[PDB]
Amino acid sequence: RPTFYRQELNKTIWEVPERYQNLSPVGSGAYGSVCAAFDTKTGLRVAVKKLSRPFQSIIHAKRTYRELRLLKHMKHENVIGLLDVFTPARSLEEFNDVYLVTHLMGADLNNIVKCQKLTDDHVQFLIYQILRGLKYIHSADIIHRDLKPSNLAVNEDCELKILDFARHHRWYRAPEIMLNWMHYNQTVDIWSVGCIMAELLTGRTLFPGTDHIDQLKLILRLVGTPGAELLKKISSESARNYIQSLTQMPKMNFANVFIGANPLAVDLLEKMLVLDSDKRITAAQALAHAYFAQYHDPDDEPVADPYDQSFESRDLLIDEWKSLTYDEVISFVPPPL
Ligand SMILES: CC(C)Cn1ncc2cc(Cc3ccc(F)cc3F)c(C(=O)NCCN(C)C)cc21
Ligand SMILES: Fc1ccc(-c2n[nH]cc2-c2ccncc2)cc1
User: Fold this and answer.
1) 145 and 88 in contact (C-beta within 8 Å)?
2) Which residues carry this modification: Phosphotyrosine?
């Protein structure tokens, strides 16, 4: 066991091993508190997240267990991974805090898009990496659910990583969630990617809606009201009525909306921003799209080992979720240096 040291940043107490030095806050919220730090054992700059009240309730305890399982499983260049997880506690009895460690990235995508407009080649490489990481995540039957510029981090090399999965198990959310459809599939993420790609090409949020209703009407204005094939798939009575009563609007021509953009980019957006989720393009299929010929390599777009999410359906006590989390802390194995 290593030796810990203690200090106060903002109003948070931080107890971490000596190897992590020069902690400086990065931000805080419901997710907990994040600090940038230097790892003397490896020489890397790292990001340390201290979970907030990890075992204060059953919802928190399960959430803590969920995040740790996910991060321990992700082993992919475009997905955030676990460098280390530790607790200052020496036993299950005193186990009360969990810290997570990962490589520090240069900036989030929301600090690039507004600082600069992106060339078509940059958009190619950035979107390509998101999809490469999404293919991996989706191969494990995991849905991110909250893909958005602030959840994508980039290095000065333009290397990208997907961060902070939505622990749910807004301008970027698929319309079937605005309609509250409880059976949305993994292509909800592909919709998010489409809204992101469009924003990089134009510099403007594609669907800057003020609420759920306003959001949907901005989406239908671009992709048009749903056809009869999609009408036949809606079970909700209120939804069906709301949609059949809206003044009908045609699908606009993306080539005209996105004038001057690479025609291969326009084509990909049209395959991503499809209202009917069954017809939306998949991450695996989008990687083979001609827009990414510069970067596509079918022997270097790997898939993930099978991920067991059976715990999601379990109804346990706080002490049981806590103990299961402790087990995952102890059995952690750092990645090969
Ligand atoms: C913006 C730069 C600091 C780039 N950067 N690089 C790595 C990294 C990790 C995090 C969060 C995080 C996740 C796993 C982990 F084990 C340790 C962690 F710290 C955050 C962050 O602060 N996320 C806040 C939550 N928001 C986005 C919803 C930011 C990160
Ligand atoms: F206006 C819309 C927008 C999106 C959808 C939709 N796309 N994929 C699945 C659905 C959907 C929505 C609600 N109920 C069932 C299915 C249906 C109508």
Assistant:
1) no
2) 307
The angstrom resolution of this structure is: 2.0
The residues pairing with 322 across neighbouring beta strands, listed in sequence order, are: none
> Ligand 1 centre from 80 Cα, in Å?
9
* Annotated binding-site residue? 50: no
**What residues pair up with 13 in beta bridges, in sequence order?**
8
The structure tokens listed for 256 are 């005209």
- Bridge partner residues of 21 (DSSP): 38
Which domains are present in the chain?
A: 4-104+304-324 (3.30.200.20), 107-292 (1.10.510.10)
- Which of 176, 183, 240, 273 maximizes ligand 2 atoms within 8 Å of its Cβ, making it the mutation to test the pocket? 176
Is the CB of 98 within 6 Å of ligand 1?
A: no
Q: What angle do CA 49, 316, 68 make, to 5 degrees?
A: 25
The torsion region of residue 274 among left (phi > 0), alpha (psi -120 to 50) and beta comes to beta
C-alpha count within 13 angstroms, C-beta hemisphere, residue 111: 10
